[PDB]
Design a protein around this ligand. Structure first.
Ligand SMILES: Nc1nc2c(ncn2[C@@H]2O[C@H](COP(=O)(O)CP(=O)(O)OP(=O)(O)O)[C@@H](O)[C@H]2O)c(=O)[nH]1
Ligand SMILES: Nc1nc2c(ncn2[C@@H]2O[C@H](COP(=O)(O)CP(=O)(O)OP(=O)(O)O)[C@@H](O)[C@H]2O)c(=O)[nH]1
Ligand SMILES: Nc1nc2c(ncn2[C@@H]2O[C@H](COP(=O)(O)OP(=O)(O)OP(=O)(O)O)[C@@H](O)[C@H]2O)c(=O)[nH]1
Ligand SMILES: [Mg+2]
Ligand SMILES: [Mg+2]
Ligand SMILES: [Mg+2]
Lengths: 426, 428, 249, 426
């Protein structure tokens, strides 16, 4: 009971989903074949949150992998922890969206979305008390940004009562591979606001910096960034799967973190992060984690919170630890940094604790921040959009597959509205 | 003949119930499996072949803590059906607990309360444990308390709540939940016992010298207090004080029934060697401001009525001398219209110590209950918190969307204004 | 007191002659028109009012109005003889059968069977929700009782019912609070110099016709006369909140 | 007792019947030489339903084979399990019908009908309690479409009190290997309505879709389709042969599922159908079987059940299973799909349970539905009929066999009549 359906779209969604499933399988001690070899009994009594049982004592993930290119499916099934996915759950098309929002939302995504909805429906009625969904995709693209928006739009109609989560990798200003990210980003984030509950924005530049300074990695690649993001994914939803001194499930973070209905764009963080060379020089105690979490160099979104107060904060600790240390430290960090908090919220921090730390570590902490400083991402993206929209450049590729000029202006007005609302409380 | 049934709601209620029932099992000799290797009649029922079942009803809207009890070390003690669970918690939301998720489960628990009450020849009252901050322990306790008041109109209900602390908190919508729960705890209760986590943390930091405490220590201390209250029903002593005798001598007016507990002597196992622990010293320690289990200042308020439940090696002459010494102190300011305000009870049963706990093997103890007026300040701060958020209507869309209306917030706040006015009215 | 038909239909000889003796006695002129109507060779055939059918376009206040005009058209009974025997404790399904046969026959109607008819008519609309209200009142050295059917559509309180008087049996959906409605009923009652003593409110009726749930009438009861109206309003608003959230059980 | 006579007409009927006899013999543990080499006693208990004992303690099927081309008998005797039939039950013509309905019913079909009635009569006095007959044939032909209807008409003249079970394969529009299908199809179903109690319509298109999509076969030959049809046929008549918790023979199904005398055309199903690759990702529980049964993609007739309601449904489970599971499953299946079921029948499912499953499984379930969506097929046939009959195409061949022209008009009238009658209850 309280099980979650997981959806993966695009290339980022598929790769990060593979990494996330590897991490969850390691947490519950599941083979790459699907069998079980966990030592403790606490790894089984909540296995049904993410996994379904099968004949022969095997566990199959409750995942749904989707794309418009069979290459991603081939890579996923070829890699490790690849054969545990149900073969039927893979859903693919003929040719990719080719970086086009209209192609993945009106022409090619629309024909294939029916099969995906059928598979989602079949997966959802195979469980009794569905907690909700969670989706992984990218905003700067056609297949992930566009079709995933349609998918959440339909799932929210067929399941109005549940909760949706989207860990969307956001375009970075500097790190940029494609040349039409602003259009797809704006068109998708028009809809992401109105059909989800918690959007955890991620940015590749921040993760690159984290691997550069905090971990000193020589040549970091997408494996490391996906590992950090998947660590955040596992950290967010531990209280549904393990016992803890003070549990906090997804709706509790939703109620604590969302003051007004439209202000649900969070950014995550994780501690402890340290280099392999400098393992021995840290004392590994709660004050270190508390200081590292609220550092400006640790958040996984390319933004410095110093230009914005925190509306609300959530901290999910993991490990056998005290409760006076946690609460007192969360008081000192809030008293001294009073300028970086909002005055009309008396208590800004929601602490939860789970009794089971990660595998390698022995105590960890996942940070979730609903700061008002995240407006700057949308600011720069809107500036780029306006610059490329003055020329009306690259626009015939969109209008030539069933899209109109007015929708661009509608999305831009919506983002001006959203940034205004976030700025309103600073 | 002298029986009470205890109800534990929410995570805090269930986790304190763990410590309470461990303490009672140690008190009466019952093993974790229920087999003893007639004072037990108050809390336990014999079921043939020497197996004693508790008179308990564990409730929660989430099967995560009750599952730990079910698979824990006390799996063979509680009746398997007494432990009642749901599917999805109240999610720190009052309306989810009182209206939406609570209405699908209330009948299954009222049936079992009826079944338990039928087994009692003479029922004294209830013992509800909950927390104000939560959504389960506010909405569900409100629902259950209304139903019990309608059904059992005569029995007295004693709450033991965990009031939110001034500084330390673990939730963003505690003021809303507390202000909503106050209506039920004022209308339907008989004696609400408020507790803070910061006060007990400080108590363990100063006296017990435990620098890194956790919830287990807090729950053990609260359980010790509850065992001290219901000692007169189980054991025998020179001056016995049952629940109705207890309620009289403490409640002068029908609405002024919010006392605050205390305990002494709490000390480490090593510090007891140097300390005399005579009756006068523990009596004086009970009245200091550093031993109150609510983060409040008794010096800025007057004690209306007081009750000192002793236990262990005590005789009434030392108690009388101690009370005489207390009454002549100037800092201990009593109210004029209560020329005597000391109810005394004595038992011959000294306190018990759990094997895994950090408390000394004392020889005599006292539980000090006080209906002082200082507790108004402990409420006043929380009202300030409410005033900061409700101005912006922050977090209100969850409450209104779950089913509740909006006027309930305003009327709960005005009721707290009335309660504080009443507490300020007396003692003039 | 008015007597009740219990022989099903047609009306048996005993109840027939009893009703005719009653009407002969009470009517001051008496035998003239009585015998004229008995021995009238031909009399005008009354028309059959047609049961209105719900339509989505037209609005719900007009729906309550329409049921009210049909009930008005049904010629409220003042013959002093009930034609359809009703039991309070009887399961609901029997009352649905009674309501549908009553609509088939379309005879004169009193307050209790009027509110049963209202329940039967409004049973088809989940958006509409209805419940009973009762008053026990004092006048001229005797106690009397009355019953009506309140409605809580579209977040507004309204009332339907029947009476020999005009304004005691019909109100629109224009009340923010139940207290305003009951105090309006109290003022209309005072207008006839009749003193209300006790007021009783039941529960929302289930929307399933073929069920055995009985109708509750005494879930809330107050002595309105003794107590000042402020406490009455407060208790009543608490009770209305307890009802619309379905908490009461 | 309660024995059944089995008749096979046409190449299609002969091949499906051969596969059916192979399946039945394997289920009962009969060697292809006719000897018995089974294990349990339940196999012998009701072996007389489909077999006759013979000297030497062998068993001979109670089957009659008919065609107008001797090649089919040659292939059947050469093929596996062909020796069990006794030679005198084979009867053949000189020259095949040449896909001519009038030839197989008036001209050369009459000269051979006497032998088939004679052997059927001789077999019907080799028993004591005959339940009914069953015939396999194809409506798109001359040898199965015409001779088959002639045979059932004669038998229904002989035995008005028994039952018949025609497992007819109907012609599909897309998968067509013949030019004159509509004429033969309409001429046969003119006579199928009156002289038959249960007709199970089967379509090659739906079968091919089942092999491609579900079983994931690469090159599905006719053997696989015949195997699926044989599995359905064996499922229908299981309660006559084995004991169960809730038995249901043929007449019980007839009374349960025929609300009105002319509405007796059904479309079957079967579960579990799983590919080789997806063997291990399934639990094999009663909910899975029930979900796979009612799937629109699991029907054996090329029609959409979503385009119409279900008058009545039956489901013959097979295996050791609880009854509460079945009752709750076929209750909630009606609860969720109230739009797809008829309101003026309070209960639409006649559930039966047997104890002995198929040899290679633990659980199975044969679904038989009586929906108003079947008439779709008939309309398509009628369209094709009125496409060719308007210009009198290919019609001189039928008149050259002594057939008159008005019969085509009468049969088309019956087609409109039956389609309207099915349309009425919707
Ligand atoms: N942390 C990671 N970031 C990635 C990864 N792959 C891409 N990214 C970023 O995603 C950005 C574009 O993402 P995608 O190619 O997946 C857009 P999508 O595939 O959904 O649409 P199409 O290109 O039409 O197929 C790219 O600029 C990269 O900077 C990854 O594997 N891990
Ligand atoms: N599932 C199967 N369908 C078949 C099979 N054989 C045929 N069919 C279909 O049957 C249809 C015609 O079947 P037949 O050849 O038996 C017509 P029939 O032999 O009765 O007349 P004549 O050829 O004049 O003897 C053809 O269109 C095929 O699509 C089969 O073996 N399995
Ligand atoms: N003293 C003490 N307090 C506790 C304990 N467990 C939880 N609490 C307090 O309970 C408060 C919140 O109430 P919860 O019990 O967590 O919420 P709930 O009643 O379970 O309702 P839900 O949120 O719906 O689960 C926190 O502020 C904690 O300080 C405990 O074991 N001991
Ligand atoms: Mg791609
Ligand atoms: Mg909880
Ligand atoms: Mg042929």
């Amino acid at each position: 009971m309280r099980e979650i359906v997981h959806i993966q779209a695009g290339q980022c969604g598929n790769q990060i989903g593979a990494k996330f499933w590897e991490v969850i399988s390691d947490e519950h001690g599941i083979d790459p074949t699907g069998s079980y070899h966990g030592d403790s009994d606490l790894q089984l009594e909540r296995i049904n949150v993410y996994y379904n049982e099968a004949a022969g004592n095997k566990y199959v993930p409750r995942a749904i992998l989707v794309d418009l290119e069979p290459g991603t499916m081939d890579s996923v099934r070829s890699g490790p922890f690849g054969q545990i996915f149900r073969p039927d759950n893979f859903v693919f098309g003929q040719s990719g969206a080719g970086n086009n929002w209209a192609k993945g939302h009106y022409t090619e995504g629309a024909e294939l979305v029916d099969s995906v909805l059928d598979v989602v429906r079949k997966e959802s009625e195979s469980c009794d008390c569905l907690q909700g969904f969670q989706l992984t995709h990218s905003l700067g693209g056609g297949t992930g940004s566009g079709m995933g928006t349609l998918l959440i739009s339909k799932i929210r109609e067929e399941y109005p009562d549940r909760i949706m989560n989207t860990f969307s990798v956001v375009p970075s200003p500097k790190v940029s591979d494609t040349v039409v990210e602003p259009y797809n980003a704006t068109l998708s984030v028009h809809q992401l606001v109105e059909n989800t509950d918690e959007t955890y924005c991620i940015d590749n530049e921040a993760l690159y910096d984290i691997c550069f300074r905090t971990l000193k990695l020589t040549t970091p690649t997408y494996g490391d960034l996906n590992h950090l993001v998947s660590a955040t994914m596992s950290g967010v939803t531990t209280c549904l799967r393990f016992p803890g001194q003070l549990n906090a499930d997804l709706r509790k973070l939703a109620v604590n973190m969302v003051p007004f209905p439209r202000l649900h764009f969070f950014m995550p963080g994780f501690a402890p992060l340290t280099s392999r060379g400098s393992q021995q020089y840290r004392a590994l105690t709660v004050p270190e984690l508390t200081q590292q979490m609220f550092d400006a160099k640790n958040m996984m979104a390319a933004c410095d919170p110093r230009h914005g107060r925190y509306l609300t904060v959530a901290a999910v600790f993991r490990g056998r630890m005290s409760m006076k240390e946690v609460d007192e430290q969360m008081l000192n960090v809030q008293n001294k940094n009073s300028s970086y908090f909002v005055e009309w919220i008396p208590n800004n921090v929601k602490t939860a604790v789970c009794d089971i730390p990660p595998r390698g570590l022995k105590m960890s902490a996942t940070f979730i921040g609903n700061s008002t400083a995240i407006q700057e991402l949308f600011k720069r993206i809107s500036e780029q959009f306006t610059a490329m929209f003055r020329r009306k450049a690259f626009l015939h590729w969109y209008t030539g597959e069933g899209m109109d000029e007015m929708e661009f202006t509608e999305a831009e007005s919506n983002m001006n509205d959203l940034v205004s609302e976030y700025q309103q409380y600073q | 003949m002298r029986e009470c049934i205890s109800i534990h709601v929410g995570q805090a209620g269930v986790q304190i119930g763990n410590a309470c029932w461990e303490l009672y099992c140690l008190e009466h000799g019952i093993q974790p499996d229920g087999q003893m290797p007639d004072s037990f009649n108050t809390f336990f029922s014999e079921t043939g072949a020497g197996k004693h079942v508790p008179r308990a009803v564990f409730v929660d809207l989430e099967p995560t803590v009750i599952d730990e009890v079910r698979t824990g070390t006390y799996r063979q003690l509680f009746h398997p059906e007494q432990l009642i669970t749901g599917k999805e918690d109240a999610a720190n939301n009052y309306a989810r607990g009182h209206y939406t998720i609570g209405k699908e489960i209330i009948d299954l628990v009222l049936d079992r309360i009826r079944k338990l009450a039928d087994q009692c020849t003479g029922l004294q009252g209830f013992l509800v444990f909950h927390s104000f901050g939560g959504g389960t322990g506010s909405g569900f306790t409100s629902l259950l308390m209304e139903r019990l008041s309608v059904d059992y109109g005569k029995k007295s209900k004693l709450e033991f709540s965990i009031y939110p602390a001034p500084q330390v908190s673990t939730a963003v919508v505690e003021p809303y939940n507390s202000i909503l729960t106050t209506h039920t705890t004022l209308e339907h209760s008989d004696c609400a016992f408020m507790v803070d986590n910061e006060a007990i943390y400080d108590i363990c930091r100063r006296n017990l010298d435990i620098e890194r405490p956790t919830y287990t220590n807090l729950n053990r201390l609260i359980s010790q207090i509850v065992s001290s209250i219901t000692a007169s029903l189980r054991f025998d002593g020179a001056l016995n004080v049952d629940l109705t005798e207890f309620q009289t001598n403490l409640v002068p007016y029908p609405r002024i029934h919010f006392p605050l507990a205390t305990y002494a002597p709490v000390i480490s196992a090593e510090k007891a060697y140097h300390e005399q622990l005579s009756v006068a010293e523990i009596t004086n320690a009970c009245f200091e401001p550093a031993n109150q289990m609510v983060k409040c200042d008794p010096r800025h308020g007057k004690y209306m009525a007081c009750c000192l439940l002793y236990r262990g090696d005590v005789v009434p002459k030392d108690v009388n001398a101690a009370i005489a010494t207390i009454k002549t102190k100037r800092s201990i300011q009593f109210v004029d219209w209560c020329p005597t305000g000391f109810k005394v009870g004595i038992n011959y049963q000294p306190p018990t110590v759990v094997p895994g706990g950090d408390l000394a093997k004392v020889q005599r103890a006292v539980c000090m209950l006080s209906n002082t007026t200082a507790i108004a300040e402990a409420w006043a701060r929380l009202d300030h918190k409410f005033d900061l958020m409700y101005a912006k209507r922050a977090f209100v869309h969850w409450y209104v969307g779950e089913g509740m209306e909006e006027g309930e917030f305003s009327e709960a706040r005005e009721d707290m204004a009335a309660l504080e006015k009443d507490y300020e009215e007396v003692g003039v | 007191l008015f007597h009740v038909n219990k022989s099903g239909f047609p009306i048996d000889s005993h109840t027939w002659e009893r009703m005719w003796m009653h009407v002969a006695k009470v009517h001051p002129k008496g035998g003239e028109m009585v015998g004229a109507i008995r021995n009238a060779a031909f009399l005008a055939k009354p028309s059959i009012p047609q049961v209105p059918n719900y339509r989505l376009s037209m609005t719900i206040p007009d729906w309550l109005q329409a049921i009210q005009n049909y009930m008005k058209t049904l010629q409220y009974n003042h013959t002093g003889t009930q034609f359809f025997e009703i039991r309070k404790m009887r399961p609901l399904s029997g009352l649905m059968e009674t309501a549908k046969e009553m609509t088939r026959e379309s005879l004169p109607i009193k307050a209790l069977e009027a509110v049963i008819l209202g329940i039967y008519l409004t049973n088809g609309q989940p958006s509409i929700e209805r419940f009973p209200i009762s008053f026990k009142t004092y006048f001229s050295g005797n106690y009397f009782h009355h019953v009506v059917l309140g409605i809580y559509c579209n977040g507004r309180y309204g009332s339907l019912g029947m009476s020999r008087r005009a304004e005691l049996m019909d109100k629109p959906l224009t009340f923010r609070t139940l207290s305003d409605l009951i105090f309006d009923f109290e003022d209309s009652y005072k207008k006839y110099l009749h003193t209300v003593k006790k007021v009783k409110i039941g529960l929302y009726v289930p929307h399933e016709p073929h069920s055995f749930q009985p109708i509750e009438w005494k879930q809330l009861v107050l002595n309105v006369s003794k107590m000042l109206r402020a406490d009455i309003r407060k208790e009543l608003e608490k009770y209305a909140r307890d009802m619309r959230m379905k908490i009461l059980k």
